[PDB]
Amino acid sequence: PRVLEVYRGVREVLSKYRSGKLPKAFKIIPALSNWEQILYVTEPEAWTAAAMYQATRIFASNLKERMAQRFYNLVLLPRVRDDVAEYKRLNFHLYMALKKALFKPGAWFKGILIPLCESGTCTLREAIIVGSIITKCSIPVLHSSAAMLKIAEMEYSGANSIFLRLLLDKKYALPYRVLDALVFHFLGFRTEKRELPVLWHQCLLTLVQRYKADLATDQKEALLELLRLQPHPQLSPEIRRELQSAVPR
Amino acid sequence: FTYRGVDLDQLLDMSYEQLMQLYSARQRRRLNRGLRRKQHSLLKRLRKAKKEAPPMEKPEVVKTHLRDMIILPEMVGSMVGVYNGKTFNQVEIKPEMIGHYLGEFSITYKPVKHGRPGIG
Amino acid sequence: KFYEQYSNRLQEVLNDYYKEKAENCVKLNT
Amino acid sequence: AKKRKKKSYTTPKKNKHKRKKVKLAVLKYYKVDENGKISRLRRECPSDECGAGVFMASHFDRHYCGKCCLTYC
RNA sequence: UGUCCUACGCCGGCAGGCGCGGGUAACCCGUUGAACCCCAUUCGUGAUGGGGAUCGGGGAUUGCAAUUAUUCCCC
RNA sequence: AGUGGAGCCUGCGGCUUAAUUUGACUCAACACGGGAAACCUCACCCGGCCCGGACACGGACAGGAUUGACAGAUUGAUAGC
Ligand SMILES: [Zn+2]
Fold first, then answer.
1. Among residues A245, A236, A248, which one has the least CA distance to residue A202?
2. N-terminal to C-terminal alpha carbon distance within chain C
3. DSSP for C8-22, written as a single string
4. Angle at Cα A98 formed by Cα A96 and Cα A104, nearest 5°?
5. What is the DSSP letter of B73?
6. From CA A95, how far away is CA A98, in angstroms rounded?
7. Residue ranges covered by each domain of chain B
8. What is the number of other CB atoms lying within 10 angstroms of the CB of residue A186?
9. Which has the closest alpha carbon to A124: A189, A178, A198, A185?
10. Protein CB footprint (7 Å) on chain F nucleotides
11. Sequence-separated (6 or more) residues with CB below 8 Å from residue A58
């Protein structure tokens, strides 16, 4: 009816949005019930990066974490993956969109990071960009630990070690189940005949720099065995040195 | 002073749609299309600067970037500075020049004085 | 919570949008 | 290779605008008599979701809701 | 070539407006009703009625905006 | 048949400009960048808001850190930046 043509009009507005105030019908989108229909009327695939930054701003600011999760999984993350794949870098507006999406961390981890990791096709540039984005944002310890348990339990991809390492650089107090999952993942790399890159070695090195004081002696010797079986000419002496000069408790 | 045989007083007191017969085709087309919000905001600014002036003193200068303004008879007496891309040019609004645009009163380029030619 | 997870105002805003779209070109007031 | 000099140049950007700090904003919401009866100075929001907790910004003529933007006269 | 290409009628000096139909196309534009060329009129060897630039006024469309002439029409 | 002589238009040098954005200089430099640019298409100029990393240290924050915002007043911009 009359609502449909107004939302076609604001669809035409959002396809060319650069700056300024948006219509007030756009800002009351989360307060409505049938949001998916009017959102598909607004055609988010044809949005401008500034318009999607404002949409992420609005949707993150208005509570209801499940709906923010659905918006991040359905609209924001495909746009990010399409922009990295074609432009080989992330836009300024979309970068601040992902930061304002990390304003809501619970919908972010379960909507942006974990679906990207379980998609399997996550490239290295996407890993670097998203890891820098989680590096900039201060993250709650519970959400970071749950995401680290998630990424530890998953099947390995080369992009996963960057996320794991940049989560270990946060230097938070770690739950001991999380460290058990990390050690079990690395000891799951014990019998792999695949050549592992320097990224995996750097993730292990980071785990030994920051959490060597909270490692049991049995898993310490297991990590020494791990270094023995899967060596590197450069990093493995340093990981061995850091494991040798560690005090527990 | 008179404009198409019409003097300034009955230019001011005349309503809007009889001015849609006394301009050129361009100005009639523009004012029939309707003026933008920025035109109307500058119009309020100019009338505010005109009302808030001493009777013997000229009004305060209103500076604007607008170059597509059509001078209506309401702005005769306004003290207006127009941007030409680099610098403001301040002008009195005279009544013999109502049928013109503001932007032609601030020229956006310099007259060319040719120097001695180089190697070519 | 992570692994186990998986109108009068409307018409008033419509009227405000229509008024805002009408106020872009006023063409009437002197 | 050939390095650079790193011209410094001083530009003072210490002055930045921030909003004013309001201290103890809860005290003006309620007025309590000496017996212990609570009087609510500010209007309660009769909205769909934010009821019984959200007050009104008291304008010079009207009231405003701070979560769903409800306007009165 | 065409979903902007236009058929028809009316208002129009003319650019153009109005009401209506066809054509997502060997169908409707469109038997594409082209221009040179041909036949009659005036001009009659001069900056000429050749040549049209440059200017002065009006009018109408395109487009948020034509002032530094967008374009077209008429003296 | 012309071009080169004339008026106009376009290209390259040069001259102006705050800017008159730009690769190529006897074929393959010369209506090539589908480039017939009034906003974008612009690479140029004159102004004006905004913020620009992690880590370490020192503050504030639960006696709210910070986020979101209707109406009105401002500057050249409907700037709750
Ligand atoms: Zn509200």
1. A236
2. 62
3. HHHHHHHHHHHHHHH
4. 115
5. G
6. 5
7. 1-120
8. 19
9. A198
10. 13-20, 45-46, 50-56, 63-65, 67-71, 76-80
11. A26, A27, A29, A30
